[PDB]
Amino acid sequence: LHKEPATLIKAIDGDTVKLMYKGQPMTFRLLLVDTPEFNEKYGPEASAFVKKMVENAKKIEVEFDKGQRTDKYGRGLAYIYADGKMVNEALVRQGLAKVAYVYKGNNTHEQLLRKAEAQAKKEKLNIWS
Ligand SMILES: Cc1cn([C@H]2C[C@H](OP(=O)(O)O)[C@@H](COP(=O)(O)O)O2)c(=O)[nH]c1=O
Ligand SMILES: [Ca+2]
Numbered sequence: 001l002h003k004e005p006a007t008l009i010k011a012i013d014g015d016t017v018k019l020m021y022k023g024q025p026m027t028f029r030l031l032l033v034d035t036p037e038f039n040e041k042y043g044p045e046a047s048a049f050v051k052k053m054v055e056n057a058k059k060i061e062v063e064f065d066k067g068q069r070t071d072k073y074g075r076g077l078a079y080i081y082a083d084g085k086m087v088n089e090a091l092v093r094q095g096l097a098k099v100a101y102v103y104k105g106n107n108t109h110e111q112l113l114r115k116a117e118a119q120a121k122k123e124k125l126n127i128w129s
Contacts, residue, residue, distance in 0.1 A: 001108055003061040003081060008054050013038055014046030014097060017054055017080065017087075021062055029075035030088045031065060032113055034100035042126055046096045050087055057082035067105035079109060092116040095125030 009018040009025055014035025017028050035046040054060060063079040071077050080087045088109065091097035093116040102110055121128045 001063055001065065001079075003063050006060050006062045008057070008060055011047070011051035011054055014043060014050055014091065016075065017050065019060060019062065019076075019080075021076065027075045028062070028080060029071055029077050030091075030097075031077050031079055031106060032099055032102055032110060033088050033091055033097040035091065035097045036127075042096060045126065046091065049091060049094065049096050053082045053085075053087055053090065054080075059083050065106040065108050067103065077106060089113055089116050093120055095120035095123070095127045095129070098127065 004021070006019040006021045009020055012018055012027065015030040015033050019026060019028055036043040038044060038047055061081040062076070063081065065077070065079070069077060086109070089112060092099060092113045099110070099113045099117050120126070
C-alpha cells in the first residue's frame with residue numbers, strides 16, 4: 001500500500017471528506033470506520049475532529065487498499081492521512097468512530113484500528129462513555 005497526494009476541497013462529516021485526487025474532485029469514504037451521522041450523538045464532535053484535522057494539515061494523502069476503490073455510491077474508499085497521521089485511526093483512538101464495514105481485501109489496517117478501538121474502549125472515550 002502507498003500514499004498518494006490530494007488536496008482538501010471540503011470537510012463533510014465524521015467519515016466523508018471532499019478531496020481533489022489526480023486533479024478531479026471526489027468524495028472519499030474512510031475505510032473501516034463508522035462515525036455517527038451529524039444528527040446523532042457525537043456526530044458533531046466527529047465532524048469537528050476530522051474537519052480540524054484536514055483543514056490544519058499541510059499535506060493530505062490518500063491510500064487505497066488492495067480491493068475496491070469506489071463504493072456503490074461513487075465515493076472513493078481509502079485511508080486518509082493528515083501530515084502522516086491517519087484520520088481513520090485517529091477517530092477510532094478517540095472513540096469518535098467504531099471499527100466497521102470490514103470487507104475482505106479492503107482490510108489491511110484492520111488490526112491496527114481494532115487496537116485503537118480497544119484502547120478507546122478501555123479509556124471509556126466519547127462513544128464508549
Ligand atoms: C465503509 C464502506 C461503506 N460502504 C457502503 C456500505 C453501506 O451500504 P448501505 O448504504 O447500503 O447501508 C454504506 C454505508 O456508508 P455510510 O456509513 O457512509 O452510510 O456504504 C461500502 O460499500 N464499502 C465500504 O468500505
Ligand atoms: Ca456514518
